[PDB]
Design an enzyme around this catalytic site. Sequence first.
Site, PDB file in Angstrom:
ATOM      1  CD1 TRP A 224      39.115  36.054  40.114  1.00  0.00           C
ATOM      2  CD2 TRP A 224      37.609  36.366  41.744  1.00  0.00           C
ATOM      3  NE1 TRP A 224      37.913  35.540  39.685  1.00  0.00           N
ATOM      4  CE2 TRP A 224      36.974  35.722  40.664  1.00  0.00           C
ATOM      5  CE3 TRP A 224      36.863  36.666  42.887  1.00  0.00           C
ATOM      6  CZ2 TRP A 224      35.632  35.364  40.697  1.00  0.00           C
ATOM      7  CZ3 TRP A 224      35.531  36.322  42.914  1.00  0.00           C
ATOM      8  CH2 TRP A 224      34.926  35.674  41.829  1.00  0.00           C
TER       9      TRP A 224
ATOM     10  N   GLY B 269      40.624  30.896  49.147  1.00  0.00           N
ATOM     11  CA  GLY B 269      41.488  29.798  49.560  1.00  0.00           C
ATOM     12  C   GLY B 269      42.217  29.996  50.886  1.00  0.00           C
TER      13      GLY B 269
ATOM     14  CE1 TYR C 194      33.001  38.080  46.352  1.00  0.00           C
ATOM     15  CE2 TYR C 194      34.797  39.081  47.574  1.00  0.00           C
ATOM     16  CZ  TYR C 194      34.294  38.032  46.848  1.00  0.00           C
ATOM     17  OH  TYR C 194      35.105  36.939  46.625  1.00  0.00           O
TER      18      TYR C 194
ATOM     19  CD  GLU D 169      32.942  31.194  45.720  1.00  0.00           C
ATOM     20  OE1 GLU D 169      33.817  31.893  46.302  1.00  0.00           O
ATOM     21  OE2 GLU D 169      33.187  30.406  44.767  1.00  0.00           O
ATOM     22  CB  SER D 170      35.600  29.439  47.590  1.00  0.00           C
ATOM     23  OG  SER D 170      36.636  28.584  47.112  1.00  0.00           O
TER      24      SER D 170
ATOM     25  CD  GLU E  36      32.100  24.331  42.274  1.00  0.00           C
ATOM     26  OE1 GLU E  36      33.208  24.882  42.510  1.00  0.00           O
ATOM     27  OE2 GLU E  36      31.003  24.832  42.629  1.00  0.00           O
TER      28      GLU E  36
ATOM     29  CE1 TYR F 145      40.669  30.043  40.241  1.00  0.00           C
ATOM     30  CE2 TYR F 145      39.900  31.496  38.505  1.00  0.00           C
ATOM     31  CZ  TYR F 145      40.611  31.297  39.671  1.00  0.00           C
ATOM     32  OH  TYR F 145      41.266  32.355  40.272  1.00  0.00           O
TER      33      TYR F 145
ATOM     34  CD1 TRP G 213      37.328  33.248  33.967  1.00  0.00           C
ATOM     35  CD2 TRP G 213      39.275  32.230  33.487  1.00  0.00           C
ATOM     36  NE1 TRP G 213      38.239  33.585  34.947  1.00  0.00           N
ATOM     37  CE2 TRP G 213      39.440  32.978  34.676  1.00  0.00           C
ATOM     38  CE3 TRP G 213      40.365  31.504  32.990  1.00  0.00           C
ATOM     39  CZ2 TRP G 213      40.656  33.017  35.375  1.00  0.00           C
ATOM     40  CZ3 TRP G 213      41.569  31.549  33.677  1.00  0.00           C
ATOM     41  CH2 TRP G 213      41.704  32.299  34.860  1.00  0.00           C
TER      42      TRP G 213
ATOM     43  CG  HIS H   8      35.219  27.845  42.424  1.00  0.00           C
ATOM     44  ND1 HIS H   8      34.518  27.004  43.265  1.00  0.00           N
ATOM     45  CD2 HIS H   8      35.857  28.732  43.222  1.00  0.00           C
ATOM     46  CE1 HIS H   8      34.718  27.371  44.517  1.00  0.00           C
ATOM     47  NE2 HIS H   8      35.529  28.416  44.518  1.00  0.00           N
TER      48      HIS H   8
END
Lengths: 530, 532
Positions: free
Chosen positions: B83, B119, B130, B199-200, B327, B330, B432, B440
């Site tokens: 990310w 966020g 992506y 997304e998010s 959700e 994380y 994870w 998420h």
Amino acid sequence: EDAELLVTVRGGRLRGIRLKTPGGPVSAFLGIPFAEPPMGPRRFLPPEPKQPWSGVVDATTFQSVCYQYVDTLYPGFEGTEMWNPNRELSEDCLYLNVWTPYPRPTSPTPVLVWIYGGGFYSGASSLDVYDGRFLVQAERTVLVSMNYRVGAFGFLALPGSREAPGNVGLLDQRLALQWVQENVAAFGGDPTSVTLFGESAGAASVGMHLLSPPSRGLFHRAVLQSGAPNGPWATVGMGEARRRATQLAHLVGCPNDTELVACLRTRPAQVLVNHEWHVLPQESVFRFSFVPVVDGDFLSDTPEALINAGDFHGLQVLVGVVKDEGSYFLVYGAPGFSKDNESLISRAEFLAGVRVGVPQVSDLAAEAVVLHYTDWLHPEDPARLREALSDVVGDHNVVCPVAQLAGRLAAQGARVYAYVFEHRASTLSWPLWMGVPHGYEIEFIFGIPLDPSRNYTAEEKIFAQRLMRYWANFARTGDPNEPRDPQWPPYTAGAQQYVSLDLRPLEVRRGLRAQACAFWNRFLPKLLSA
Amino acid sequence: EDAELLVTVRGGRLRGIRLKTPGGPVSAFLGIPFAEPPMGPRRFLPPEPKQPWSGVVDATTFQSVCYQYVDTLYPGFEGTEMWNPNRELSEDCLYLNVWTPYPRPTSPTPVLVWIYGGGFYSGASSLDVYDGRFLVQAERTVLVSMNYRVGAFGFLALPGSREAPGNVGLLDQRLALQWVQENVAAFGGDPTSVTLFGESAGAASVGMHLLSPPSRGLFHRAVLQSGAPNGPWATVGMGEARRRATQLAHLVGCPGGNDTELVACLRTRPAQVLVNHEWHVLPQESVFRFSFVPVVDGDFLSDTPEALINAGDFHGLQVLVGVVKDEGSYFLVYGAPGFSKDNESLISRAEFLAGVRVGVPQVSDLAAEAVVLHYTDWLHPEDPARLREALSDVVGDHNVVCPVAQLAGRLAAQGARVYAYVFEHRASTLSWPLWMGVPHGYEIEFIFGIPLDPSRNYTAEEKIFAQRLMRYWANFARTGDPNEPRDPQWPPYTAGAQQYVSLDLRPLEVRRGLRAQACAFWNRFLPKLLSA
């Protein structure tokens, strides 16, 4: 003349009667005066001990029922009529009844004292359903029941006044208990081994004696059936009590506490009764006008405060509920309800019924209730709504107050046994949708199914015998359990184990509606404070 | 000079690149400038349209990542590194990317426009996950992604001021959407058939374009994955935004407001300096709260997203919305006491109670008690495993599932055709811990068809699954309905039946209620409790 039916108590001599049961005879002394008649200037006053008499008091029949409202919702219906007065009404009603084995037990026998329910506005020790003969024959205990004043006569309070101090019905019960201390040995009972039991307002009364030190010395164990002193209906605060007493006075044409009570005292008993319901602050179910008042005397604090402060080591308690506590009350005011149809209500009636079933809380509190009792996958299903409103009324008024009592008592040293009574009587006249309604375990505890003239099944008789045995065991030892073979474990705040009582053997389960009761007992009070 | 790699847009000429894919060739135009660089005097200002250029711009590689905080919670760990920015950080970051089939379509083709999440404080269109090449090849659509400013650079707001009006990051998105309308047809795309997906925070952005009229004319359909504009984290009020901006300014030594003077002082600060202090302006320690996010100021959003949703008429709108199975998980390793990716995170009751205040930040003690009441199992109030699951649900329900459910519900009741899913497959490549379930962000790689990349080691089943999902998304973009000609059918979500489908390796299974009981608490009751 039969010497076994002649007994001398402190007040003087009594003549009893021999009663038949399918298991053999039993001695009964019915209509024993234990207080001076609380009439005229004595109305609203604490009971005075019965003065000694000469000659022989006839104790062969039930005495009068304390003045009270008579239910007329379903005239002629057995479902309601079985709870109505079956003797003439009178303010001269302070008598008690003793049943004992025949012949009289030559050695000290455990004593059960029954305190009837009836919302503190009704009830009588002479109801068929409370016939003590079967319990006494089968389990060889002494059984005592008393009448106590109800309605305005027992619970009208102008707090602080000497003319209407309030809680006199409770003092009637305390007087009967002192009577038992002084006289029960004369019937072969052991005053050091008294178990109190009661149902609904009866259970609430038992709980209040547990929390009142002058009463607490008068008995050893307690059984609370479908009721608790911490209910939202069982007590009223001084202010609201005063408001209700004053409004009653106004409604009956009365205008200073002294003057107000003096005017009330001039009124025929039936006149107070006729207006009793109208002093409630709103339309509701499971609320009653004149109840025990928290005024710092009989109860030095709220029952919930007292329960949390108490050390309960040395106390054993038996507590329980029926499977469908709320259903019965719904037909007394919830919109869309009737014993004569399926009572399949709409969402709107559900929403309105919540305000009636949980009266006198803020709109926010009501929404919280709606939130918890709504199945948001099926928010409008009539059958589910019916069940949910019954649960609201039952949880709020009986189950959750009982669970709190049980949890707190256990956590503070009492040994607690809990049950859910799950058998629907074959003789039940209320509709099927009501399930096992409030009050319908009582006939089993008293062994009524043993009466041949009634139409109970063979299995129901065996079941009644099991229940009498659990109750009597508990009275004798503090533990309902029979010798090993499926055992009834004590209820604890952690494991929360209880048993289901019906025709099949005991089954141990966990949680007296733990999720619902966290809501009523833990969260809602916080919400109400803000 | 290959003609398929040359395109003329309104600004000028573009040269693209030919991408290989395990299905066939795709044309990519990466790093197309769509605004003037928002640097220097242009920091905090709404984007200016890119001025025409002479000659040819090489759109042959992803451009810089917008300046942003870089996660360091678990250095070197794939689950977090994936990310993080994979190009250099710059304030000069306003570029977008177009993928089109090779050769260029001859009839107008549906366009998918991707808005990344992060966020509102991070993210980039250049992330491997992506990569639009597989979608374009498999489903023959045009795909477009843009970079938009994040953190303070995109969302610092001194409402009322013209030097930092706020929401500029959303205006970056809008400008890119306008670029699509003006230019997408030159790549063979149909500007009448644009489907936004994100997304998010990307999903929240999509929702906000739905509720802002100027944006609403720039697209036709919407996909919201694991996010909604009505989430308690996606917007902030005017006073709170001002407080945060003012506090940031104070932290970097900026004197406490003529707004022009204050912003001018902020403009002199090195980008990295602002980033270094971003997190320290939040009112309390928490998870799922971000310093600088969209502000409700009357302009971009005329009212709160909640009110706009309740008031809107959405007849003629098709929306696809969903969540992953877990959700909340994380987010718990980012501040909840007792949590770690490296142990089981089997917390005590006390840690649970303290975690509730972290996870449901800035609500009254009573509200917090209500949360504890609903998420406690009163037969097992202290069981560590149940407590861990419960806190995950608290965070996930409050921030994602319940805001999505409310959105879906209201949109349906008001005329929209809505489809809802729950994504239930845990990737074989997930780094994870097992306790996090399906976390998420981990459906995205399947929607983009990443498993079809040879260099990656997904199972054959996952490749088939990826293909199913790409097909659903593309079917929705083309027709407003994810369904294929009859065989297992995905029915529409409605306020009453509340039907949605589970997405994983097995065939569609239809279910009812997006955590209906929980969401009644979050959506119907809690707001009433907070008004008192």
